Protein backbone atom coordinates (compact mmCIF):
# COMPACT_ATOMS: atom_id res chain seq x y z
CA UNK A 1 0.00 0.00 0.00
CA UNK A 2 2.91 2.32 0.65
CA UNK A 3 5.17 1.36 -2.29
CA UNK A 4 4.47 4.66 -4.04
CA UNK A 5 4.90 6.86 -0.97
CA UNK A 6 8.18 5.13 -0.16
CA UNK A 7 9.37 5.52 -3.76
CA UNK A 8 8.67 9.27 -3.64
CA UNK A 9 9.72 10.07 -0.06
CA UNK A 10 12.29 7.45 0.98
CA UNK A 11 12.53 6.16 4.52
CA UNK A 12 10.97 8.27 7.28
CA UNK A 13 14.04 9.92 8.85
CA UNK A 14 14.92 9.66 12.56
CA UNK A 15 11.90 7.44 13.34
CA UNK A 16 10.38 7.06 16.78
CA UNK A 17 9.13 3.51 17.48
CA UNK A 18 5.41 2.87 17.86
CA UNK A 19 5.11 0.02 20.36
CA UNK A 20 2.94 -3.04 19.90
CA UNK A 21 0.70 -2.12 22.85
CA UNK A 22 0.00 1.23 21.16
CA UNK A 23 -0.63 -0.47 17.80
CA UNK A 24 -2.91 -3.00 19.51
CA UNK A 25 -5.02 -0.14 20.88
CA UNK A 26 -6.01 0.78 17.29
CA UNK A 27 -7.00 -2.64 15.89
CA UNK A 28 -10.14 -2.18 13.75
CA UNK A 29 -9.93 1.56 14.43
CA UNK A 30 -7.13 2.43 11.95
CA UNK A 31 -6.67 0.33 8.75
CA UNK A 32 -4.15 -2.49 9.26
CA UNK A 33 -2.16 -1.70 6.11
CA UNK A 34 -1.36 1.70 7.62
CA UNK A 35 -0.50 0.25 11.04
CA UNK A 36 1.78 -2.37 9.50
CA UNK A 37 3.54 0.39 7.54
CA UNK A 38 4.18 2.16 10.88
CA UNK A 39 5.24 -1.10 12.54
CA UNK A 40 7.98 -1.41 9.92
CA UNK A 41 9.01 2.18 9.22
CA UNK A 42 8.37 3.71 12.63
CA UNK A 43 7.25 7.34 13.08
CA UNK A 44 9.60 9.67 11.24
CA UNK A 45 10.16 12.75 9.08
CA UNK A 46 9.77 13.25 5.31
CA UNK A 47 10.92 16.08 2.98
CA UNK A 48 13.08 17.66 5.69
CA UNK A 49 10.12 18.34 8.01
CA UNK A 50 7.39 19.08 5.46
CA UNK A 51 5.47 16.17 7.04
CA UNK A 52 6.13 13.99 10.07
CA UNK A 53 4.27 11.03 11.52
CA UNK A 54 3.16 10.99 15.13
CA UNK A 55 1.89 8.52 17.69
CA UNK A 56 -1.91 9.08 17.90
CA UNK A 57 -1.81 8.21 21.58
CA UNK A 58 0.60 11.10 22.28
CA UNK A 59 -1.54 13.73 20.49
CA UNK A 60 -5.11 12.60 21.39
CA UNK A 61 -5.61 15.58 23.71
CA UNK A 62 -5.20 17.85 20.67
CA UNK A 63 -7.97 15.96 18.87
CA UNK A 64 -10.04 16.10 22.06
CA UNK A 65 -9.63 19.88 22.33
CA UNK A 66 -10.10 20.72 18.66
CA UNK A 67 -13.09 18.44 18.08
CA UNK A 68 -14.56 18.68 21.60
CA UNK A 69 -18.25 17.92 21.51
CA UNK A 70 -18.71 17.41 17.78
CA UNK A 71 -21.44 14.95 16.80
CA UNK A 72 -20.12 13.87 13.39
CA UNK A 73 -16.33 14.06 13.95
CA UNK A 74 -16.25 12.55 17.41
CA UNK A 75 -12.78 13.00 19.01
CA UNK A 76 -13.01 9.49 20.53
CA UNK A 77 -13.09 8.05 16.99
CA UNK A 78 -10.55 10.43 15.42
CA UNK A 79 -6.86 9.67 15.51
CA UNK A 80 -3.95 11.99 14.73
CA UNK A 81 -1.49 10.23 12.40
CA UNK A 82 0.94 13.01 11.41
CA UNK A 83 1.20 16.69 10.64
CA UNK A 84 2.67 19.20 8.22
CA UNK A 85 5.48 21.54 9.25
CA UNK A 86 2.83 24.08 10.39
CA UNK A 87 0.81 21.72 12.58
CA UNK A 88 -1.85 20.73 10.04
CA UNK A 89 -2.84 17.26 11.31
CA UNK A 90 -3.60 14.29 9.07
CA UNK A 91 -6.14 12.31 11.12
CA UNK A 92 -8.18 9.17 10.61
CA UNK A 93 -11.87 9.30 11.52
CA UNK A 94 -13.34 5.83 12.01
CA UNK A 95 -16.68 6.82 10.41
CA UNK A 96 -15.70 9.28 7.67
CA UNK A 97 -11.99 8.45 6.98
CA UNK A 98 -9.30 11.01 6.18
CA UNK A 99 -9.62 14.25 8.16
CA UNK A 100 -7.45 17.40 8.20
CA UNK A 101 -7.21 19.64 11.28
CA UNK A 102 -5.63 22.98 10.34
CA UNK A 103 -4.31 24.18 13.71
CA UNK A 104 -2.84 27.45 12.39
CA UNK A 105 -6.02 28.68 10.66
CA UNK A 106 -8.61 26.91 12.89
CA UNK A 107 -10.24 24.87 10.11
CA UNK A 108 -11.34 21.24 9.72
CA UNK A 109 -11.93 19.43 6.43
CA UNK A 110 -13.56 16.08 5.69
CA UNK A 111 -14.34 14.62 2.25
CA UNK A 112 -16.28 11.65 3.62
CA UNK A 113 -18.68 13.88 5.56
CA UNK A 114 -19.82 15.36 2.23
CA UNK A 115 -19.40 12.62 -0.39
CA UNK A 116 -20.03 9.06 0.77
CA UNK A 117 -17.05 6.68 0.71
CA UNK A 118 -17.67 2.90 0.65
CA UNK A 119 -16.14 1.24 3.73
CA UNK A 120 -14.04 -1.15 1.61
CA UNK A 121 -11.99 1.83 0.35
CA UNK A 122 -10.57 2.66 3.83
CA UNK A 123 -7.09 1.19 3.26
CA UNK A 124 -6.90 2.88 -0.15
CA UNK A 125 -8.30 6.16 1.26
CA UNK A 126 -5.60 6.42 3.92
CA UNK A 127 -3.04 5.33 1.34
CA UNK A 128 -4.04 8.15 -0.97
CA UNK A 129 -3.81 10.67 1.87
CA UNK A 130 -0.28 9.53 2.76
CA UNK A 131 0.89 9.76 -0.88
CA UNK A 132 -0.37 13.35 -0.95
CA UNK A 133 1.55 14.91 1.98
CA UNK A 134 3.75 16.88 -0.42
CA UNK A 135 0.90 18.96 -1.90
CA UNK A 136 1.34 22.73 -1.71
CA UNK A 137 -1.81 22.88 0.42
CA UNK A 138 0.32 21.56 3.31
CA UNK A 139 2.72 24.47 2.98
CA UNK A 140 1.51 27.73 4.48
CA UNK A 141 1.34 31.09 2.67
CA UNK A 142 2.39 34.30 4.38
CA UNK A 143 0.31 37.52 4.25
CA UNK A 144 1.54 38.22 0.70
CA UNK A 145 0.35 34.77 -0.47
CA UNK A 146 3.92 33.44 -0.72
CA UNK A 147 4.71 29.97 0.63
CA UNK A 148 6.84 29.87 3.80
CA UNK A 149 8.32 26.35 4.19
CA UNK A 150 11.53 26.71 2.12
CA UNK A 151 12.52 30.01 3.73
CA UNK A 152 11.73 28.63 7.18
CA UNK A 153 13.78 25.49 6.53
CA UNK A 154 16.78 27.62 5.50
CA UNK A 155 16.51 30.32 8.18
CA UNK A 156 15.31 28.28 11.18
CA UNK A 157 16.79 24.87 10.33
CA UNK A 158 15.11 21.48 10.06
CA UNK A 159 12.33 20.57 12.46
CA UNK A 160 13.10 17.88 15.02
CA UNK A 161 10.48 15.14 15.44
CA UNK A 162 7.73 16.58 17.60
CA UNK A 163 8.22 20.24 16.60
CA UNK A 164 6.42 22.58 14.17
CA UNK A 165 6.87 26.13 12.88
CA UNK A 166 4.50 28.38 14.83
CA UNK A 167 3.93 32.14 14.98
CA UNK A 168 5.55 33.81 17.96
CA UNK A 169 2.76 36.42 18.16
CA UNK A 170 -0.44 34.90 16.84
CA UNK A 171 -2.21 36.81 14.00
CA UNK A 172 -5.45 37.00 15.99
CA UNK A 173 -3.59 39.20 18.53
CA UNK A 174 -2.02 41.46 15.91
CA UNK A 175 0.81 39.12 14.93
CA UNK A 176 2.03 38.85 11.35
CA UNK A 177 1.76 35.76 9.19
CA UNK A 178 5.32 36.25 7.92
CA UNK A 179 8.52 34.18 8.14
CA UNK A 180 10.01 36.70 10.58
CA UNK A 181 7.27 35.92 13.15
CA UNK A 182 7.66 32.12 12.86
CA UNK A 183 9.68 29.98 15.34
CA UNK A 184 10.32 26.24 15.85
CA UNK A 185 8.41 25.04 18.93
CA UNK A 186 7.23 21.90 20.71
CA UNK A 187 4.23 20.69 18.70
CA UNK A 188 2.15 19.21 21.54
CA UNK A 189 2.50 22.35 23.71
CA UNK A 190 1.83 24.80 20.86
CA UNK A 191 -1.10 22.72 19.58
CA UNK A 192 -2.48 22.54 23.10
CA UNK A 193 -2.64 26.35 23.17
CA UNK A 194 -3.94 26.82 19.64
CA UNK A 195 -6.70 24.23 19.89
CA UNK A 196 -8.13 26.08 22.91
CA UNK A 197 -7.74 29.61 21.51
CA UNK A 198 -11.09 29.84 19.74
CA UNK A 199 -13.38 27.60 17.68
CA UNK A 200 -12.79 25.64 14.47
CA UNK A 201 -14.81 25.94 11.28
CA UNK A 202 -15.65 22.83 9.25
CA UNK A 203 -15.39 23.28 5.49
CA UNK A 204 -16.80 21.26 2.61
CA UNK A 205 -14.00 20.69 0.07
CA UNK A 206 -16.33 18.49 -2.04
CA UNK A 207 -17.96 21.47 -3.82
CA UNK A 208 -15.83 23.95 -5.80
CA UNK A 209 -17.35 26.70 -3.62
CA UNK A 210 -15.49 25.26 -0.58
CA UNK A 211 -18.17 26.73 1.71
CA UNK A 212 -18.07 27.05 5.46
CA UNK A 213 -20.53 24.53 6.89
CA UNK A 214 -20.56 25.02 10.68
CA UNK A 215 -18.53 25.47 13.85
CA UNK A 216 -16.92 22.33 15.28
CA UNK A 217 -18.67 21.27 18.49
CA UNK A 218 -21.86 23.09 17.43
CA UNK A 219 -24.82 22.46 15.15
CA UNK A 220 -25.14 23.86 11.64
CA UNK A 221 -27.42 26.90 11.38
Experimental method: X-ray
Nearest to 76 by CA among 18, 37, 25: 25
Q: How far is CA 182 from CA 6, 55, 124, 164, in A?
A: 30, 25, 35, 10
- Smallest CA-to-CA distance from 82 within 204, 191, 215 is with 191
Measure the CA–CA gap between 93 and 82, rounded to whole angstroms.
13
Task: Report the Cα 195 to chain-centroid distance in Å.
Answer: 13
Q: What is the resolution of this structure in A?
A: 2.4
Cβ pair 47, 76 in contact under 8 A = no
The answer to whether 99 and 109 are in contact (CB under 8 A) is yes
- In angstroms, the CA 20 to CA 16 distance is 13
What are the C-alpha distances in Å from 173 to residues 169, 197, 200?
A: 7, 11, 17
Question: If you count them, how many residues does the chain have?
Answer: 221
- HEC readout, the chain: CCHHHHHHHCCCEEEECCCHHHHHCCCCCCCHHHHHHHHHHCEEEEHHHCEEECCCCCCHHHHHHHHCCCCCCCHHHEEEEEEECCCEEEEEECCCEEEEEECCCCEEEECCCCCCCCHHHHHHHHHHHHHCCCCHHHCCECCCCCECHHHHHHHHCCCCCCEEEEECCCHHHCCCCCHHHEEEEEHHHHHHHHCCCCCCEEECCCCCCCCEEEECCCCCC
The domain containing residue 170 runs over which residues?
Answer: 2-221
How far separated are the first and last CA of the chain, in Å rounded? 40
Say how many domains are in the chain: 1
Widest CA span of the chain, in angstroms? 47
Residue 185 backbone phi and psi in degrees, to 5: -140, 165
152 neighbors 85 (Cβ within 8 angstroms):
yes
> In whole angstroms, what is the distance from residue 146 CA to residue 91 CA?
26
220, burial (CB in 10 Å: exposed 0-12, middle 13-18, buried 19+) = exposed
Amino acid sequence: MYENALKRFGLPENPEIMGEADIARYKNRIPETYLDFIRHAGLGIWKQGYFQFCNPEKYKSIVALALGGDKQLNPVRTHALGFSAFGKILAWNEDYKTTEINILLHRVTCRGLFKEIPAERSDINLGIAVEGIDAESFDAPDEKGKLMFNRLLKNLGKLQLGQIYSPKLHPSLGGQLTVENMRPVDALSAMTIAAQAGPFTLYDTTKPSTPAVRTIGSLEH
